[PDB]
Structures are given as structure tokens and as C-alpha cells.
């Protein structure tokens, strides 16, 4: 059946019933819609089975011809085979409910800059589709892995523009697909499928299929007598985990109780970000402003991402974050398209919240290396271009869904001033390291589940934890709990007061109290 894919399945079934379910309206209003889609993603148990499922969801000829199964040796037989299959498609358009499909067109579609015959292939397939423009009830589903793997001159407007990626393997989808797979093969009755699922980050569905496959393989090769009713034990699944690697590739929920200190910044973020969403009509009856961009900064090491996620939690709004590791792929020209796609999903779930983490990593030095920083400034340009795209309308019923972008970092100069300019971002808030009281509160809240006892008094550590960080205190109490455990051994529930001090004199913090002043002064001069 369908495994962890029904979301994109439903979305695409909508986008395709739109032309298919009502053909007697376009020319009725001169409204030729897009005709041709691109399913990009790791194929196998998903994409093609999905297109099957959806053509069924409507009723359509599953003409599932794998495109690389029609290659020709001499120029002329190839394009005529294309004529053949597209003629099948057209005489199908003479029929009722239907759909044309193919897969792995990438082999049949290199990119531009290549030799001559690719020109012939692409021009003649463009011919066939531009002829089918007049057909009745058929379209083309180019099924490939990565959209870039295709010819650009075929993704034009009025051409293969509706481009959708297969799903990304989320945990819920992981469990769904494991269940779907095992629905036809006997696995033991003691499987926490979600366990292996979370063990399989990056592993797409088909990878999981393969995992279970080789698992059962060594199950058979390991079971001896009852080789007919395999109780495929999860130990062999671990065995499989070993003998496998995944491909290339903040759902974690949080709460405000998990954080304390710097209540001013919390109240601020509550004021100028979430409250527009929770009181939009109130805002506009006030009509004060919608600050579209917000920037945050302090000393690096206060786990600011946690506060960002807490904000993302207290609103229920669709939240998406963007990191340099999520960004720094080995493809040049990919960062721009990535951030574009992210903002595209933003405007897709138009009430969205987007967040750029460590923009220093997202955008490095401006001109430190004065010759090899071209694509970074190109990302800068495309970013600036997409930024002022958030300019909405409806000045002084109140429907206006914008995406208030927030970012945060600690290296101010490394950024570009035009971003900070009040044309794009006009709110920059300071995240100073906690005071004595903030350290007290952070200790209390990070300790509220640690092994504690009778001799605890956090105020003394507070007096001694000046010029620390939150992560500093957290690592401190963790290693101290380690000491407490190993001292009295495993079987122990007691507590201490001093091994914390010892860990203190082991772990030395950002004691300077000067670099914070540097960042603060620089930011304050930067806005």
C-alpha cells in the first residue's frame, strides 16, 4: 500500500484532478493550465507505487513505461519510439479517465551544454508535448531522482514547471512504511518498529525495505529447523544496521518551563512576533506596524536555538529552521535554490514562521578572502531579493499572512549591513549572559530532574558561577552527577556539594567579560 507518503500523494492528486476532473472548462474560459509534472526523489517502494495508487485514486491507465527501456542505438529510432509512445498517449486522450506516466526520464534527459543529439531529443519531446497541448485527458509525469539531473530547457513555464519532491522520511512515515512492508512478510511479534525507524536517520523507505530484506536473509541463513515460519528476531535487524549505510540524507517540541532568565527578551519576542498571529485584527485595529524581520544576539553558548524553538512552540504555527549544515551541501548554486524552496514552503503554509540559525554559518565572511567569496555574495543577493518579497498589502476582513523572519547569531561584523538596514530587518534584540539571578534560575530548572538530595544549595555555585554560560552550568552539573554516581557506585541515590566545585576548576568558562562587551558594542553600532 502507501507508506508514509499519503501527504504528497494527496497534494498531487489535488493538483492533477484540477485539470483532469474538469477538462470541459479551460477552453470554455481559455484557461490552459499546466500540463506536466516532475516527481523528483529516490524511487522504488515510493514514487512509482504512488503514481500507481493515485491514477487508481482517479481511474487512469497506468502506462508505467520505464523511460530508459526505450533507448535506441541509431539516431532516428529513438525519437520515433518517442513518437510511438506519445501517440499511444494521444489515442488514449481520445478516451475517458486516463493518465500517461513514465519513470527515470533522467537517463533520457541530460542537461544543457552537452552535444548535438540531446538537442534533437529535447526538441522532439517538446514537440510531442506541445502537440499534446491540444490533447484531451492526458499529461506527462516525468519521474526522476533530482530535478537538476534533467535538461533545464524542459522545465520552462508552460512546460515541466509543477515540480514536486517525494517525501522526506519522517519518523511517523518511517513507522508507516515499515508496517506497510512487513504487511506481507512474517516478522517477530516483539518489534518496536519506531526504534529501528529512529535508528534509520537518512534511510529512505527503500533503504528500510532492503534492511528488512537482508535481515530476513540472515534469519533464514541462521534459523535451522523452522525455516518456514521465520520469527525474524530484531537481533538480526541490528546485524543489518551494521551492514548498511544511508544516503546523503526542529520537530523536537519544547516549552518555556525548560528555560529561564532574560525575561525581557521573552516578553519582547512574545510582543512583536507571536502576538501579531494571536491578535492580527487587534494589531491592525491598532495598525501600529508589522516588523517583518527580527535579529537576536548575545554570547555564543546560551542555547538560543532553544528559545527560538520555544517561540515556535507557543504558537502552533508551521515552523521551519535553516542551518548551515542543512545548507552547506557540496553543490555550488544549491544554497540559493534551497533557501528559495524554504521560503516557497513558507508562502505555501502561508501562516509560517521561518528562522535562520547561526547566519554567520549561513553567510560567512564578507571579504576576508578577497577572491574566493563569489557564491556567498550570490546567496547574499538572492536572499536580499527574496527578503523584500514579504511586502504585503491591505493598509488601513484582515487576512494578511506574512512570514516574520527571525535570525540570531553572535558575530556581528561577519554579516552584511544591507540586511540589518531598516529596509529589511528593523528589530535587533540583545541576549546578554545571565546575571546572578539568571544563573540561579537556570541551575534550578536544569536540575529539576537531576539526582538531588539534602545537602544542596545552589546559591553558592551561583556566587561562584560568574562569567559562565547556561551550557557551562548544564555540563557542570552533568559531570558532577557522574562523579557522584561513580563514587558510591551504581547503586546510589545520595548527593554532594563539592564535586561541582571540582568540576568548576576543571571546566574553565568564558571568563573574559570583555568579548561580550565587544559583541554588544559592535551590534549597538550596527543598528
Amino acid at each position: 500500500p502507501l507508506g508514509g507518503l499519503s501527504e504528497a500523494a494527496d497534494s498531487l492528486r489535488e493538483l492533477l484532478r484540477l485539470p483532469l476532473r474538469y477538462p470541459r472548462a479551460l477552453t470554455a474560459l481559455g484557461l490552459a493550465v499546466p500540463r506536466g509534472v516532475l516527481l523528483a526523489g529516490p524511487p522504488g517502494v515510493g514514487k512509482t507505487q504512488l503514481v500507481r495508487a493515485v491514477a487508481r485514486e482517479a481511474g487512469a491507465e497506468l502506462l508505467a513505461v520505464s523511460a530508459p527501456a526505450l533507448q535506441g542505438s541509431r539516431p532516428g529510432e529513438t525519437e520515433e519510439n518517442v513518437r510511438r509512445v506519445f501517440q499511444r498517449a494521444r489515442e488514449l486522450a481520445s478516451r475517458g479517465p486516463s493518465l500517461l506516466f513514465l519513470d527515470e526520464m533522467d537517463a533520457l534527459c541530460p542537461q544543457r551544454g552537452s552535444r548535438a543529439p540531446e538537442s534533437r531529443v529535447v526538441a522532439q519531446v517538446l514537440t510531442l508535448l506541445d502537440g499534446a497541448s491540444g490533447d484531451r485527458e492526458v499529461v506527462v509525469v516525468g519521474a526522476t531522482n533530482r530535478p537538476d539531473a534533467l535538461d533545464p530547457a524542459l522545465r520552462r513555464p508552460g512546460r515541466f514547471d509543477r515540480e514536486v519532491v517525494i517525501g522526506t522520511p519522517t519518523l511517523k512515515q518511517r513507522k508507516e512504511i515499515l508496517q506497510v512492508i512487513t504487511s506481507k512478510m512474517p516478522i517477530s511479534s516483539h518489534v518496536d518498529l519506531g526504534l529501528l525507524a529512529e535508528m534509520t536517520v537518512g534511510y529512505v523507505g527503500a533503504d528500510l525495505t532492503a534492511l528488512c530484506r537482508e535481515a530476513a536473509m540472515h534469519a533464514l541463513l541462521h534459523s535451522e529447523k523452522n525455516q518456514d515460519n521465520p520469527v525474524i528476531d530484531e537481533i538480526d535487524f541490528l546485524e543489518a544496521f551494521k551492514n548498511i549505510q544511508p544516503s546523503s540524507f526542529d520537530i523536537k517540541p519544547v516549552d518555556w518551563e525548560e528555560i529561564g532568565g532574560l525575561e525581557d527578551v521573552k516578553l519582547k519576542l512574545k510582543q512583536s512576533i507571536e502576538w501579531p498571529l494571536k491578535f492580527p485584527w487587534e494589531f491592525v485595529r491598532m495598525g501600529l506596524t508589522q516588523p517583518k524581520g527580527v535579529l537576536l544576539y548575545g554570547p555564543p553558548g546560551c542555547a538560543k536555538t532553544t528559545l527560538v524553538r520555544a517561540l515556535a512552540t507557543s504558537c502552533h504555527c508551521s515552523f521551519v529552521s535553516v542551518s548551515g549544515a542543512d545548507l552547506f551541501s557540496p553543490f555550488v548554486g544549491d544554497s540559493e535554490k534551497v533557501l528559495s524552496q524554504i521560503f516557497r514552503q513558507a508562502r505555501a503554509s502561508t501562516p509560517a514562521i521561518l528562522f535562520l540559525d547561526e547566519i554567520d554559518s549561513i553567510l560567512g565572511a564578507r571579504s576576508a578572502s578577497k577572491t574566493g567569496c563569489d557564491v556567498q555574495e550570490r546567496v547574499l543577493s538572492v536572499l536580499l531579493n527574496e527578503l523584500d518579497g514579504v511586502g504585503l498589502k491591505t493598509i488601513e476582513e484582515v487576512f494578511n499572512r506574512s512570514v516574520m523572519i527571525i535570525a540570531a547569531t553572535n558575530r556581528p561584523d561577519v554579516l552584511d549591513t544591507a540586511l540589518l538596514r531598516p529596509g529589511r530587518l528593523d528589530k535587533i534584540i540583545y541576549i546578554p549572559p545571565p546575571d546572578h539571578k539568571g544563573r540561579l534560575s537556570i541551575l534550578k530548572v536544569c536540575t529539576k530532574t537531576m539526582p538531588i538530595g539534602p545537602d544542596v544549595s545552589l546559591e553558592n555555585l551561583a556566587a561562584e558561577t560568574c562569567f559562565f554560560s547556561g551550557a557551562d552550568l548544564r555540563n557542570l552539573c552533568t559531570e558532577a552527577a557522574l562523579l557522584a554516581l561513580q563514587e558510591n557506585g551504581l547503586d546510589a541515590t545520595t548527593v554532594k556539594q563539592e564535586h561541582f566545585l571540582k568540576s568548576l576548576k576543571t571546566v574553565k568558562p568564558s571568563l573574559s567579560c570583555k568579548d561580550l562587551a565587544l559583541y554588544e558594542n559592535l551590534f549597538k553600532k550596527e543598528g
Binding site: 510511438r84 501517440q87 489515442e91
Partner: protein, 183 residues
Amino acid sequence: PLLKLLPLDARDRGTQRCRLGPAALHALGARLGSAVKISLPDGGSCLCTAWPRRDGADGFVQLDPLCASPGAAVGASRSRRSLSLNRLLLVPCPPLRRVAVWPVLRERAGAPGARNTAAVLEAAQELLRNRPISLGHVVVAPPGAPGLVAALHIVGGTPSPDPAGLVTPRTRVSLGGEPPSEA
């Protein structure tokens, strides 16, 4: 008894007939060119024309599945399985006044539409000459056959051709055109 099932050399492979040794021919006593309903051991009966073995041999049965059972065609080749004589039957053949068919067409890819029915009707009337067919059966066309037709799924039979029936040169062939029970 029990009979082996050799493959089929080219000459026969063209036409419909099925060869057989004079032993079994004496058994069921059919003169020649008769009909023999054959039930494949893989589900789906078949119908063929009788013709004696070339060399008075014994116990072997080469056959060709022209008048097949739907989809069960290829199940006739590529085997070494036996075939018990009881799996064959002599079937009476009436002259079958009028018939009615639903044809596929050959993929003359490049010109479909309105299909000049005189053409397809002539070709079908050709491919059905003097053959015995039994209702509920495909009739493939031989390779490199002329014309356009490539299938004659058999539906309408006037004197109820349930066992089988012989289409004669003076039999109406109504190109009815009702694809039956497509599932």
C-alpha cells in the same frame, strides 16, 4: 495411457493443427481434421484440429494453441509435462450459421479512427475461414498475417457454440464489438 508434450516445429507452428500418434487416434476414433477439446494442465481449455503423426510413432502429442482459452495461451509451450488421454475430448462441430466478434486491432500506429470497417471486416472474415472455434476463446493471428486484425475474442454465436462450432464460408460475421467481462 500417458503422453509427452514435445515442442512444435515451425511448419505446424504456423497453422492450427495438432499432431498425434495413430494409437490415440484409434482411441477416440476421429477421422481427420476433426476438433479436439484439449484441457491444458494449467487451467483453461484449448481446441485444435486433428492430424496424424508423420511417422506412425506413438504416445507423443505436439499441439499448437491457436484457439486458446483467454490468457492461457503460452501455457501450452515450454514444458515437459505429461498429458493424459482423458484430458482430450472429441467435440461435435455444427455449421454455425452466423457469428459475432469483438476484435483488437494491430498497432498500425499512425492512423486510427473510423477504421474503414470494410477492411477489418474482410480481414476477419478471412482469418475465420473454415476454422472450428468454440465460444469464449481468443483466436490469435498467425505471425506476419496480412491485414489489420490480430484478435477475434469470440462472443456471439447463433446456434449456441458452447462445445465448439465450425465457421463456414457462408456465415455472416457481425463485427458486434462488445469487449466482454474485462477484469
